[PDB]
Design a protein around this ligand. Structure first.
Ligand SMILES: Nc1nc2c(ncn2[C@@H]2O[C@H](COP(=O)(O)OP(=O)(O)OP(=O)(O)O)[C@@H](O)[C@H]2O)c(=O)[nH]1
Ligand SMILES: Nc1nc2c(ncn2[C@@H]2O[C@H](COP(=O)(O)OP(=O)(O)OP(=O)(O)O)[C@@H](O)[C@H]2O)c(=O)[nH]1
Lengths: 441, 170, 453
């Protein structure tokens, strides 16, 4: 049941810092790690064991490991959270600052210093007994981050074949670095196709747009984006962190969301939230979640083919409004003729040890979906990669180790990545059709 | 308290018997008990409010509420409702009460009980006839309002029944 | 048969009329300019019904079911600043298209057709946020070219988007037009779509508005805000039959049933007694009138809101709504006196209709002189003269083709011949409307079915 957070790259470090601050504010842990709750009452309804290891000093150390080639962001996080994290759970590869935004250098550093990471994760696992899997937070655009993520994914799949792995990948926005970052993105995508079990996608452009819409200042900061990522991760993990009757593990969530390991990419949405009045009921929250103006990914589709959806509503809700919103969603959303029209609603309790968020008494809702927008994003990324590769031969100039010894193997690996992502999008557009399950029907 | 007060009064007045003091005490007792009954029936039971609700429901005094009920049960009046479990009919009646202007009375606690006092009973009138013709409204009273107000009693003249049938045809 | 009605404010005049109407309803239902109902949410017992016009999000807030659409963001920002939290900021449409490039109907039609997706999405959202719907109420404001074009585009979208909903429109006509040719062109292009798609249309001539605002008010100068105040009070009075539902008329369709004898005749004429909810309403307790005098004033041409020009007017459907403590004996006396004074057609024996409403328990009580007010809506063909003024302007200017360099841009036709043909079709359709009206004014209109079965 215990999940270990893996913060890869400076993006991973930022999102981990934000998520741990949010979880401390929720479970009354603070920055010092000591239990901010009185020692007179031990009855608690939350679950901090899979995320926080409680020591004899009653301090809750976050079960997180930071793997990054840039020690500056790790030192900044340690300075901001002095007394929170464990110095033994810090890994900077002892190679200095980062150098090169390609996947090759990241994977080479991972393969070189895999022994230290393996020892760290083995110690973290042996510290407890009940284990379920790991949690990875990285960006597919960052070269070193993607390399470290691929290395740790390979290590996990060839060491612990029984632990389900979930990751959160934030795709880059429409910018200049996509001529080279697309290589790292498609390599991470191939690694996810090969070994990953669950992945939650994010689009940087859509995230920036949503943050600029919900915020007053249009100058959206990367810290604000990381705060939004922390909020969505807390909303999707509330069901595990506060288990009451139905949901007590991510296993059931991924069972009801992911139908097959070939389709293990999920698009999140969450509305409404701040980062002070109530104006949206549960029906309003559900229709806003359905509307593309509240999703954390770029839809770019008039009517996406919804395969599996699951929503968690936070707040005091009425079954009548729940049924009305469910009927409206069933009437609006179209489901394929081969897959069932399953719609799951989980009522997540609020944390009494968490300070009151702005816009009090406003019911909110998160929704994880599997539709044909992630495939549009993947198609855009693969088209950009194909264009830049077939037009300019510049990727053979920035490589390390085996990728630098010969550039032919690099082109072969990239062609294999393109082939596997093409097979993925073909399987997705086939599952979009009703003739997908015709082999048994 | 009333019995004890007038008991000590009559105990003090026992030496007179039948006299003007006895007559005026009887008059005061009658006036006080009638005023108390009126106040209780108007406050704890809302006699006038129940009369207005009956005039609005049975006598169709609330045209908006009647039109809301008609537009809510138009499909029920269209299809033959002679053979139905009536649970859907009760649900439609509750939804119409919620949608009409009577939602204020439904939210009000005492008026909620006043509305719930209406019995959702349908008397089948006709074999395979239309839903409008087979529909019937049956009201059952409860004390202490039954001793005052009059309804379509099985041993009466069905005044409210025939008036409701006439307004229903119209 | 009672459903909710969504308000559509269009143009500057339409937005002002909608703002005044919403302020009047807030004053009546004790809602104020803050959106939060001045009455506590504990006293839920309300004789009125704000649900058909106010969406209840919270227990104390009532957001009006209205959408504003305009090309000038200044008036929208002013309205939103005056009504802090009262209106919904998501129901304000400006398209960031800047100021209107002229007073042409084609400009408004183009600015509606281009941003049709946004307004249609907003209408769909407003419809999904409710359950029971009956129709929309559009404020055309045909005096403005952009507003008339926007209203025409809205009507041409709603007619084929929701054919099961009854549509009512309010066309405000000016007294003396500044640019007579352009304003006549805009009004004719709006009336084309009004005849084509609009189910009900109420005209408001500014001549009688200016006359009433100069007579009943003390200040000689007339202001547009207190001019639109009269139209907003008229709209509130005609929607009272649904807000405070009476015992006879409780639905917009039920009201229009006795007012629209045929889809071709969908133009009415309003009339109202000296108002009591306006700014200068202190000079009302000195008239000392009764229900019979109120009916006489309603039937008088001096109280109508449109240019009467009564030359033996042929009445088709006359209806009146009296709000206050009305007496049935006085009502019968007024009916007996009016049946011997109102011209009635010999082919239809239908007489005038009377309805009695209820007064708001929170409105300021007036003395026994003007405590009872009245509104009248009559189907008179006198509006064909207001339309004949514009058609004569069209016939006297169209022989040359002036101001053709303004209606050519924006619309789907950039050539002069197409615009000329469209204007000729508009002239033909308004001529056919006037001919149908002058034929229904006679007895042969009913004899058409008697001579052929
Ligand atoms: N949203 C968000 N993304 C970040 C943040 N920091 C880094 N990133 C990601 O990092 C990418 C840019 O590359 P780099 O910052 O050099 O990451 P890298 O290539 O792995 O290099 P290092 O971070 O030094 O290991 C962007 O595309 C982002 O996706 C952050 O604070 N917020
Ligand atoms: N009586 C009256 N007329 C108004 C009012 N507001 C606008 N108008 C009309 O509007 C005309 C002036 O043009 P604008 O007000 O700019 O209308 P428009 O040209 O369509 O521009 P927009 O309203 O912004 O779309 C005048 O001839 C008036 O008839 C008002 O408040 N009262």
């Amino acid at each position: 049941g215990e999940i270990i957070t893996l913060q890869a790259g400076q993006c991973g470090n930022h999102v981990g810092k934000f998520l741990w601050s949010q979880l401390a504010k929720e479970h009354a842990i603070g920055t010092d790690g000591l239990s901010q709750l009185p020692d007179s009452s031990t009855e608690r309804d939350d679950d901090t064991k899979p995320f926080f290891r409680e020591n004899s000093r009653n301090k809750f150390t976050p079960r997180a490991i930071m793997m990054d080639s840039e020690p500056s962001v790790i030192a900044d996080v340690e300075n901001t959270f002095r007394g929170f994290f464990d110095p033994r759970n810090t890994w900077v590869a002892s190679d200095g600052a980062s150098a090169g935004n390609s996947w090759a250098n990241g994977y080479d550093i991972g393969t070189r210093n895999q022994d230290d990471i393996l020892n760290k994760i083995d110690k973290e696992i042996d510290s407890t007994d009940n284990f379920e899997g790991f949690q990875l937070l990285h960006s597919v655009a960052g070269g070193t981050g993607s390399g470290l993520g691929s290395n740790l994914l390979e290590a996990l799949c060839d060491r612990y074949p029984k632990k389900i792995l979930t990751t959160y990948s934030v795709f880059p926005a429409r910018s200049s670095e996509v001529v080279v970052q697309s290589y790292n993105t498609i390599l991470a995508l191939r690694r996810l196709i090969e070994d990953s079990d669950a992945t939650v996608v994010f689009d940087n452009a859509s995230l920036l747009n949503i943050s600029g819409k919900v915020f007053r200042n249009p100058n959206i900061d990367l810290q604000h984006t990381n705060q939004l990522i922390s909020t969505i991760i807390s909303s999707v993990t509330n069901s595990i962190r506060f288990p009451s009757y139905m949901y007590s593990s991510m296993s059931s969530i991924y069972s009801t969301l992911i139908p097959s390991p070939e389709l293990h990419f999920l698009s999140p949405s969450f509305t409404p939230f701040t980062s002070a009045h109530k104006g949206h009921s549960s029906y309003d929250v559900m229709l806003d979640l359905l509307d593309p103006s509240n999703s954390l990914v770029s839809t770019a589709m008039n009517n996406p083919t919804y395969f599996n959806v699951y929503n968690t509503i936070i707040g005091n809700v009425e079954p009548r409004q729940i049924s009305r919103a469910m009927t409206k969603l069933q009437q609006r959303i179209k489901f394929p003729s081969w897959s069932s029209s399953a719609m799951h609603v989980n009522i997540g309790r609020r944390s009494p040890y968490l300070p009151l968020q702005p816009n009090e008494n406003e019911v909110s809702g998160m929704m994880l979906s599997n539709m044909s927008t992630v495939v549009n994003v993947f198609e855009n990324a693969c088209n950009t990669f194909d264009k830049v590769f077939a037009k300019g031969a510049f990727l053979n100039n920035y490589n390390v180790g085996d990728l630098f010894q010969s550039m032919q193997n690099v082109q072969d690996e990239f062609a294999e990545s393109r082939e596997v992502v093409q097979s993925l999008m073909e399987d997705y557009v086939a599952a979009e059709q009703d003739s997908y399950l015709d082999d048994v029907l | 308290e009333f019995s004890k007060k007038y008991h000590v009064l009559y105990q003090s007045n026992s030496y007179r018997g039948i006299s003007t003091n006895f007559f005026e005490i009887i008059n005061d007792q009658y006036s006080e008990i009638v005023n108390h009954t009126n106040q209780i029936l108007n406050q704890k039971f809302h006699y006038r409010d129940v009369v207005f609700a009956l005039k609005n429901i049975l006598l169709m005094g609330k045209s908006d509420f009647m039109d809301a009920l008609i537009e809510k049960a138009n499909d029920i009046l269209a299809t033959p409702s002679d053979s139905l479990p009536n649970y859907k009919l009760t649900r439609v009646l509750q939804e119409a009460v919620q949608l009409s202007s009577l939602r204020h009375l439904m939210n009000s606690p005492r008026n909620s009980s006043v509305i719930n006092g209406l019995d959702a009973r349908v008397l089948d009138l006709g074999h395979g006839s239309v839903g409008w013709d087979v529909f019937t409204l049956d009201y059952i009273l409860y004390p202490p309002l039954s001793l005052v107000l009059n309804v379509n009693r099985p041993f009466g003249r069905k005044e409210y029944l025939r008036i409701f049938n006439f307004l229903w045809r119209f």
